[PDB]
Design an enzyme around this catalytic site. Structure first.
Site, short mmCIF file in Angstrom:
data_model
loop_
_atom_site.label_atom_id
_atom_site.label_comp_id
_atom_site.label_asym_id
_atom_site.label_seq_id
_atom_site.Cartn_x
_atom_site.Cartn_y
_atom_site.Cartn_z
N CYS A 17 0.82 -1.20 0.00
CA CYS A 17 0.00 0.00 0.00
C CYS A 17 0.86 1.26 0.00
O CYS A 17 0.58 2.21 -0.72
CB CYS A 17 -0.94 0.00 1.23
N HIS A 69 1.81 4.92 9.77
CA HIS A 69 0.85 3.91 9.35
C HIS A 69 -0.13 3.37 10.39
O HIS A 69 0.23 3.13 11.54
CB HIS A 69 1.70 2.76 8.79
N1 LIG Z 1 -4.30 -4.12 5.64
C1 LIG Z 1 -3.68 -3.43 4.74
O1 LIG Z 1 -3.71 -2.18 4.77
C2 LIG Z 1 -2.85 -4.11 3.59
C3 LIG Z 1 -2.57 -3.17 2.53
C4 LIG Z 1 -1.82 -3.67 1.42
C5 LIG Z 1 -1.36 -4.98 1.28
N2 LIG Z 1 -1.71 -5.81 2.40
C6 LIG Z 1 -1.23 -7.25 2.31
O2 LIG Z 1 -2.36 -8.11 2.11
C7 LIG Z 1 -2.17 -9.40 2.78
C8 LIG Z 1 -3.29 -9.69 3.74
O3 LIG Z 1 -3.37 -8.53 4.64
P1 LIG Z 1 -4.73 -8.35 5.48
O4 LIG Z 1 -4.53 -7.14 6.27
O5 LIG Z 1 -5.95 -8.43 4.67
O6 LIG Z 1 -4.76 -9.51 6.50
P2 LIG Z 1 -5.84 -10.37 7.20
O7 LIG Z 1 -5.36 -11.08 8.43
O8 LIG Z 1 -7.07 -9.57 7.56
O9 LIG Z 1 -6.29 -11.36 6.08
C9 LIG Z 1 -5.55 -12.66 5.84
C10 LIG Z 1 -6.69 -13.63 5.61
O10 LIG Z 1 -6.15 -14.88 5.05
C11 LIG Z 1 -6.65 -16.00 5.82
N3 LIG Z 1 -5.55 -17.00 5.79
C12 LIG Z 1 -4.38 -17.04 6.50
N4 LIG Z 1 -3.66 -18.11 6.18
C13 LIG Z 1 -4.39 -18.79 5.24
C14 LIG Z 1 -4.17 -20.01 4.49
N5 LIG Z 1 -3.08 -20.78 4.63
N6 LIG Z 1 -5.14 -20.39 3.60
C15 LIG Z 1 -6.27 -19.64 3.44
N7 LIG Z 1 -6.57 -18.49 4.07
C16 LIG Z 1 -5.57 -18.12 4.97
C17 LIG Z 1 -6.99 -15.45 7.18
O11 LIG Z 1 -7.89 -16.31 7.94
C18 LIG Z 1 -7.53 -14.05 6.80
O12 LIG Z 1 -8.93 -14.04 6.51
C19 LIG Z 1 -0.76 -9.32 3.46
O13 LIG Z 1 0.15 -9.94 2.48
C20 LIG Z 1 -0.54 -7.79 3.55
O14 LIG Z 1 0.83 -7.42 3.55
C21 LIG Z 1 -2.42 -5.43 3.53
#
Ligand SMILES: NC(=O)c1ccc[n+]([C@@H]2O[C@H](COP(=O)([O-])OP(=O)(O)OC[C@H]3O[C@@H](n4cnc5c(N)ncnc54)[C@H](O)[C@@H]3O)[C@@H](O)[C@H]2O)c1
Ligand SMILES: NC(=O)c1ccc[n+]([C@@H]2O[C@H](COP(=O)([O-])OP(=O)(O)OC[C@H]3O[C@@H](n4cnc5c(N)ncnc54)[C@H](O)[C@@H]3O)[C@@H](O)[C@H]2O)c1
Ligand SMILES: NC(=O)c1ccc[n+]([C@@H]2O[C@H](COP(=O)([O-])OP(=O)(O)OC[C@H]3O[C@@H](n4cnc5c(N)ncnc54)[C@H](O)[C@@H]3O)[C@@H](O)[C@H]2O)c1
Ligand SMILES: NC(=O)c1ccc[n+]([C@@H]2O[C@H](COP(=O)([O-])OP(=O)(O)OC[C@H]3O[C@@H](n4cnc5c(N)ncnc54)[C@H](O)[C@@H]3O)[C@@H](O)[C@H]2O)c1
Lengths: 337, 337, 337, 337
Positions: free
Chosen positions: C153, C180
């Site tokens: 992001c 952040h």
């Molecule tokens: N939150 C943000 O602002 C943001 C912004 C940009 C990029 N990201 C990236 O996006 C990704 C996810 O971030 P997020 O904040 O949504 O996290 P999050 O914890 O809310 O979502 C991860 C999800 O994946 C599921 N999960 C975990 N391991 C799994 C597996 N082996 N199989 C299937 N499902 C599985 C979890 O139960 C959960 O629903 C990360 O790589 C993060 O760096 C996050």
């Protein structure tokens, strides 16, 4: 058609304006806003709100004495003493008193001295001031009342279903606790305050504090005089609160029966006032709800067949403000207030 | 031995009293406290603090005009206008001005009109008021100064290591951003304020806002006049802040060399003022630190050999207050102030 | 028309679904959702969101293997190992990898082993994985890429205006700090974590932590290779973050000139990607903005004529998700991915 | 003298170690710590704590398998399956089970399979597991119990004064609500969880959730079987919670009489367990209190002469942990457990 003036453009004043703005064919005409701050703030804070979000309307400053919302210009004045206000000169019918500092007769009466015909306090009135809760006792309102109170937010949440519990099961005695969001009356960081508890950092503590909301219920439901009491627990959430009521009733009952009674009213006499939620939600999901009370059906409990416990949600800012508009509408309908 | 008066028993006033209380053989004698609140609050809030915890000392109210801390009684008065204060009658030597509303000469000068011999402002002074930062330019203080400023908290954090960077590498130009805890000057919930950003709910937003701390640095380190500027980002933490400095220097260098220079001073001329932390800590770990600045060595970076970035921590309440006591001690040492 | 699968229905997965839902004539067809939780959670959490609010759409559970949004049914499976997923059997074209645990080739490649034709990682890719930032280098995307990354992001916020600064003023070297919002990768209360800082209570601290976003910028703007670096400061806000960039440029300039350059691009090549805000807002006002970067024009500063400081806002959840949809659209447009 | 092992070095595990550390002439000898994280985290998180502050003791890592606190070395292992633990080989007498995932007989029994002689669960036990609350029913403990439970934090707060109310006034029926700080079992941001309410962002909501603490009270005070029930309201505070109890009693009484009964016990049989506070404090003031329950005397209310309402504070982390140590001491005193 009713010339309305807002005195105190704070949380309630601004929510009031926005609630009103979203109503259709309103009998109310907001023409003046009096706060101590300026016109730039009134405009800015009306447009951007950390709780409601950006106001979906064209808001801008108009000169150095007014703001306009979607073209409608609204006069903005700044007088700390209500007696110096141009209510008479403008022909103000109703003043929405939401400063929190003129809740008694002498203080709120000052708007009358300035020329306004009537005052509606957005809080409990101190002393002899008729208090109403839409959906509970509004019908007892008469145009003769020069100063009226719309009670507190917790009273508007409690009274509605308390009325149902009393009508259907007979309340013998009861108590209540509201886990309430913090408000501007609390301090951001430990600072002086008459209330030694409300003086402590609001976003860092669970803060016990008084509330008359329970005794206040008896004002609108006389049958409950001397039967209820309670307290408030302020917690680190910016908006939306919840009431926890425990009463001993005359008729033995059980949780689902109590819930059923609430749906009965929520679908009829209390439609638009009381709602009953069957989903497992949390506080933020109740933000911006127009009703003044939403029963969390699954939390309802009954002990020893006559001790009933009800948990109800309420948006203390927006839901309460819909009620002020509602009460203002009633005032408009009972002749040029 | 120096008769001291505290004007404004808020966050700084109370931290000041507690810092002083923990010092050994202090040249200072706190005899009066003037706030607008009452004696019950002064006592209560001095004892219980959401940030420092319960004061480990016997604090109680003494009649209706004083409080006592471990037996030592302290007079408590309540006058909103400094000119009506009994400074002369009590023979007050130094007034610790921490209300935040008398930071210019006419306002702070009012304590002098009331009889106090000298005033120490716990904030930047507006206009022509000597400002000092212990460990950077305190030696230039003279007893002739009737009104002095101890600068802001961010200046006391920045100046110390800025001085080292300038002495060892030669600062050409620079900028800075402080991710600062919120303070009483911000609003708990969106409310009127001259600053349209500081008017928004403090615990719900990242709030940009001005700071003179950067320009202020030049007041204590003249060699940096017109070479620095910056801003503040207020965030939802009750205490402890962090500065992020970026400067272009004359002598090419690298991170560990810069860190080494800071340890050199931290072990010598800036001992007690500047510290260098090599552990991967977070803000709360720096609560109650007596120094006014702690470099986070591992965050130090150097780009293109001459662009240096330093990240330093500081307890804006307690660390700054140790400095006020320190400056007060200096005033006591330079003859009955 | 493009059969899309979401792997990891978390913050990004759900924001992705909602962003997509609001688009008109989308080339994308979301048919499967794979998370480890169940169908009740997928449905419940998609409908109620503490940050976006209640989803304005009819969401409900469909049997024990699907959810429906406004009638459109979506298969829901639960396999922790991507290799066991029915991607091949369903004929899945593109997998939106948002679990945060399959960001390298062997891990993300597992979706390919399961039958999916392509994978789009919603995060920086580790190793040799093409990374794109819509509005900066998307045009270099080719259908031959089986695994691609949409960067982080912070990179999507930085890259856009960094590109403008480089094109118009020539970036020599620079540094950056992002204040952040916290994310699911941080701990609610001090708990074990590989990062000793991200292990500390997120809502109680300012938490320094690493970020590759700066080096990552060079991946999409090769001209900046080895010219930038930085760090992240996690603070107690649930969503919306801000970047603070400081660069030494070749062409002398001044703040308003720099701001003007940003408006030039914001009105042309970067329309929809970069925005320039002239109002004194705070973080919450930028919630739900579709752009990936909004310059706070009034905070722009220039020291010594060549040191430029820019402050830009970004909704790290929603804005980034609009970009994932955008990149998915591109993948759909470059032939059945 | 009693060889103790801590399984799960989280909030309770670390508070346990620190509570123990401050005791004089302890019968307990902590020799092993098993968590899933590593030795660097165990050491780091034991030293720095966002709630308790920096541990006033020399904590450091010892090789790659131990940590030392003021010289005393403690073995650190990492096995997710309790059956693989070296309890037998080390001759572990008592295992402090604080992982929250082995609260039933088969799960906690695994420590026995590994060689430990006894297990003390730092939470309610599921199934047939003796549960004790120091100061209420500890005397019924026998060395024959191989697996025991110290109940939940809310039970340890409620049971103590419930016992007094029952002994002196006769509890007919009652209900309770605990406004509880959030815990690691809640999600930082809306994320999957079996509890659809505990799945929502903890620091942004008032979160209703179940609690067996009320029914659990009957386990330690059999006379109250089937007479109590309640719920929990999780709020955005990191530590310290409060219970709100409402009961109908047999003997008519009044608030100050009820308060007096609590002081009677607080000065005698419940000294060290129950305390009665007469100052108007807020949650943070109760941080680090060794008792497990503190009545807020001024909030006590009595309606209709027989409906009693009591508000009591409790440090759910530290106070509860003092109780675990206390129960461990009892186990040590009843023969080499
Ligand atoms: N939150 C943000 O602002 C943001 C912004 C940009 C990029 N990201 C990236 O996006 C990704 C996810 O971030 P997020 O904040 O949504 O996290 P999050 O914890 O809310 O979502 C991860 C999800 O994946 C599921 N999960 C975990 N391991 C799994 C597996 N082996 N199989 C299937 N499902 C599985 C979890 O139960 C959960 O629903 C990360 O790589 C993060 O760096 C996050
Ligand atoms: N916030 C809530 O949930 C809530 C709910 C129900 C009832 N109320 C009641 O509404 C009233 C206002 O509450 P609020 O939360 O909106 O507070 P607030 O601080 O946000 O608003 C008060 C406003 O009045 C202005 N003001 C103060 N003194 C004034 C004076 N002498 N003349 C003119 N303007 C003046 C302030 O500048 C401010 O804009 C109080 O009586 C409160 O009890 C509040
Ligand atoms: N909080 C910090 O981190 C911090 C750090 C450094 C410098 N400062 C400076 O210190 C000053 C005070 O800051 P604070 O955070 O302690 O604020 P504060 O609100 O907690 O304290 C101000 C106190 O002064 C009292 N007061 C206000 N007007 C008064 C008057 N006319 N007469 C008498 N008492 C009056 C208030 O009732 C209050 O107790 C400001 O100038 C601020 O810039 C604050
Ligand atoms: N926090 C409180 O106020 C509180 C109060 C009373 C009782 N409790 C109970 O104590 C228990 C732990 O609560 P907590 O808040 O300390 O939680 P926590 O998350 O901080 O601690 C659990 C710890 O156990 C570790 N762990 C998890 N699974 C493991 C496994 N299979 N093997 C080894 N280590 C493992 C984790 O890494 C972590 O360090 C729960 O049963 C809870 O109900 C908590």
């Amino acid at each position: 058609k009713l010339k309305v003036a807002i005195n105190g453009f704070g949380r309630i004043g601004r929510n009031f304006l926005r609630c009103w703005h979203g109503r259709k064919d309103s009998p109310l005409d907001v023409v003046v806003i009096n706060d101590t701050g300026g016109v730039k703030q009134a405009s800015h804070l009306l447009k951007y709100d950390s709780i409601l979000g950006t106001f979906d309307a064209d808001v801008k400053t108009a000169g150095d004495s007014a703001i306009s919302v979607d073209g409608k210009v609204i006069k903005v004045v700044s007088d700390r003493n209500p007696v110096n206000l141009p209510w008479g000169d403008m022909g103000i019918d109703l003043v929405i008193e939401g400063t929190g500092v003129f809740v008694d007769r002498d203080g709120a009466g000052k708007h009358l001295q300035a020329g306004a015909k009537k005052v509606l306090i957005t809080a409990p009135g101190k002393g002899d001031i008729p208090t109403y809760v839409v959906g509970v006792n509004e019908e007892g309102y008469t145009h003769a009342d020069t100063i009226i109170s719309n009670a507190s937010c917790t009273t508007n949440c409690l009274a509605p279903f308390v009325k149902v519990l009393d009508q259907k099961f007979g309340i013998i005695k009861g108590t209540m606790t509201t886990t309430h969001s913090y408000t501007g009356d609390q301090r951001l960081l430990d600072a002086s305050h008459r209330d030694l508890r409300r003086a402590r950092a609001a976003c860092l503590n669970i803060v016990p504090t008084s509330t008359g909301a329970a005794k206040a219920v008896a004002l609108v439901l006389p049958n409950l005089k001397g039967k209820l009491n309670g307290i408030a627990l302020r917690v680190p959430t910016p908006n939306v609160s919840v009431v926890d009521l425990v009463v001993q009733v005359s008729k033995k009952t059980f949780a689902e029966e109590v819930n059923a009674a609430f749906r009965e009213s929520a679908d009829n006499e209390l439609k638009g006032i009381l709602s009953v939620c069957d989903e497992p939600l949390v506080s933020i999901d109740f933000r911006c709800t127009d009703v003044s009370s939403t029963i969390d059906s699954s939390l309802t409990m009954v002990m020893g067949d006559d001790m009933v416990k009800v948990i109800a949600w309420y948006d203390n800012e927006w839901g309460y403000s819909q009620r002020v508009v509602d009460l203002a509408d009633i005032v408009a309908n009972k002749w040029q207030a």
